């Protein structure tokens, strides 16, 4: 849901 590390549920961040 953030921008750090590959990508989360939607956004390009897992952190």
Q: Are 13 and 5 in contact (CB under 8 A)?
A: yes
The owner of tokens 């939607």 is 10
- Token readout for 9 is 């549920």
Experimental technique, in short, is NMR
- Token readout for 13 is 């961040």
Sequence-ordered list of residues with C-beta below 8 angstroms from that of 13, at least 6 positions apart, any chain: 1, 2, 3, 4, 5, 6, 7
């Amino acid at each position: 849901l953030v921008v750090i590390v590959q990508a989360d549920w939607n956004a390009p961040g897992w952190f």
